[PDB]
Amino acid sequence: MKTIIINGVQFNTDEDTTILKFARDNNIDISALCFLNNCNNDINKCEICTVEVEGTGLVTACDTLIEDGMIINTNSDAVNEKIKSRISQLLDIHEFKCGPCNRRENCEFLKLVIKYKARASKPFLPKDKTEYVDERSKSLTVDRTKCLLCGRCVNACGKNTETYAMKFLNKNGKTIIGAEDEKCFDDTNCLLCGQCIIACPVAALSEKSHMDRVKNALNAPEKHVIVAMAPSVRASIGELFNMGFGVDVTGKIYTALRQLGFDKIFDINFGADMTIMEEATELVQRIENNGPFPMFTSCCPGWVRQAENYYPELLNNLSSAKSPQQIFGTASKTYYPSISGLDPKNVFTVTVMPCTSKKFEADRPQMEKDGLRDIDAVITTRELAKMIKDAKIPFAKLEDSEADPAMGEYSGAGAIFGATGGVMEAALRSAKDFAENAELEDIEYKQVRGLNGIKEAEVEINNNKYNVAVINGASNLFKFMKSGMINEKQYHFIEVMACHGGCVNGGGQPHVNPKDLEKVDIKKVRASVLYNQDEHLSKRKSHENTALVKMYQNYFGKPGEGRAHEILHFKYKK
Ligand code: SF4
Ligand code: SF4
Ligand code: SF4
Ligand code: SF4
Ligand code: FES
Ligand SMILES: [Mg+2]
Ligand SMILES: [Mg+2]
Secondary structure (H helix, E strand, O other): OEEEEEOOEEEEEOOOOEHHHHHHOOOOOOOOOOOEOOEOOOOOOOOOOEEEEOOOEEEEOOOOEOOOOEEEEOOOHHHHHHHHHHHHHHHOOOOOOOOOOOOOOOOHHHHHHHHHOOOOOOOOOOOOHHHHEEOOOOOEEEEOOOOOOOOHHHHHHHHHHOOOOOEEEEEOOEEEEEOHHHOOHHHOOOOOOOHHHHHOOOOOEEEOOOHHHHHHHHHOOOOEEEEEEOHHHHHOHHHHHOOOOOOOOHHHHHHHHHHOOOOEEEEHHHHHHHHHHHHHHHHHHHHHOOOOOOEEOOOOHHHHHHHHHHOHHHHHHEOOEOOHHHHHHHHHOOHHHHOOOOOHHHEEEEEEEOOOHHHHHHOOOOOEEOOEEOOOEEEEHHHHHHHHHHOOOOHHHOOOOOOOOOOOOOOHHHHHHHOOOHHHHHHHHHHHHHHHOOOOOOOOOHHHOOOOOEEEEEEEOOOOEEEEEEEEOHHHHHHHHHOOHHHHOOEEEEEEEOOOOOHHHOOOOOOOOHHHHHHOOHHHHHHHHHHHHHHOOOOOOHHHOHHHHHHHHHHHOOOOOHHHHHHOEOOOOO
């Protein structure tokens, strides 16, 4: 073993790890900042994790290994003044205005300033933030007046996407972070997945705001404003109201959306069932025509952009079915009027997503028809949360209400969409019933679930074996293709999500403090909410959605053909 003295307390351990990690595992407080995802800022260590080691001096605990004979002190005056100096220096480059800041209620930096009572040697107060702000992107926004240059976004992008779209840049001899050549992120190989935002300890990286689109549309007398949340929203937004993790708040969201003044409360899970109708039918179609295999999902715009930027040869292999968001939006301007009498142009369709990329998908030029946008606005989970708080809605104390069932009902299949393997399973539940023309009892495909990067399974459909795969994260898509796993066998249907764990870990999701990520498996705790809804729902198949069946019977007809194929589909091409 090793003998380690920390603050006078002796430890006898055989572990090989860092001071920070060992300290955290023994309830010994050590501050940190730039350390996240088992990596720190190598070229510019923040030194917030400084601790004293007798015979060595001050050392960074987040990358310093424990060694026998170490006598560590974490709270000496020499350590605190050092940490206080670094935080003070960061403040010299930080616009310290927490009042209007969108991270006011969960900023790692603010908590560090309060903790050490640090103050700026000179308050950073830029007159014009123009040069510091980049709002060119449809999904991302950079405010470099808040940027600590901790590199956590850069490292996050590398790990999650392996695109390294977020880079350190030298602008006029000044270190900043941004896209390649300081271009607009959209104009680069960036996936707009927002993982860089999630890793950001401050409000330096945020989503491109759409709240003005919403509030204007709401206050517009003639505008009929629809709202519909994604699957993952009802399993995460509760976190930003001190309700904890893994708490279902579906009913509370519906009520909150009515108090905010939305004219109609629908649900994207209804659109998730639609996507399954239009994707399960296509899978069966491609089987009969024998290809083109494999069929890739197309509901994740992060993946779409990844295909557009790295694998354009696969764009014709993507499912023509629109994403649950876009497919919902299409029906909102055509079907919903036909059952409400509303003038389509007065219909304003808003979605609540866990995703920053969804903003880019919704504003795609061709994502419309007859001048009518499928989706007019997308607000992240964080945006809706702020919208609720600004309205002074006591969310945690709201009583449950239901959505409007015309486009608000959803089966358990559409419910699990928010988790990696969700779309896959949901699609197989319908495709097997379609191909075999039956109503099979066994519908649970646990094989394609979980947090494994790459997941594969052999499924039987109409007395024939087919190979499916589920790519869990953009970095795993790169690995899947580069390593030649695609060519090792003939796959017939592949799911691809950009964010590891699925949309429950989207870029528009609530920020989780590093100390909570250690205590909670955010990806599984969030997904559990979705699977629990699937288990307790009467309808667990997309095509068993009564409200949707009505819609298809009375308006669209059959899926994968006629009117359905006409307007609910969207093909990508190189
Ligand atoms: S980023 Fe954090 S510390 Fe800086 S102004 Fe915003 S809330 Fe305050
Ligand atoms: S944008 Fe955020 S994560 Fe990136 S360097 Fe600045 S503070 Fe760190
Ligand atoms: S949105 Fe995703 S791909 Fe783009 S820079 Fe951020 S982490 Fe990288
Ligand atoms: S996995 Fe979901 S949340 Fe992440 S980029 Fe794709 S659609 Fe958005
Ligand atoms: S947390 Fe250790 S150097 Fe940043
Ligand atoms: Mg390191
Ligand atoms: Mg109104």
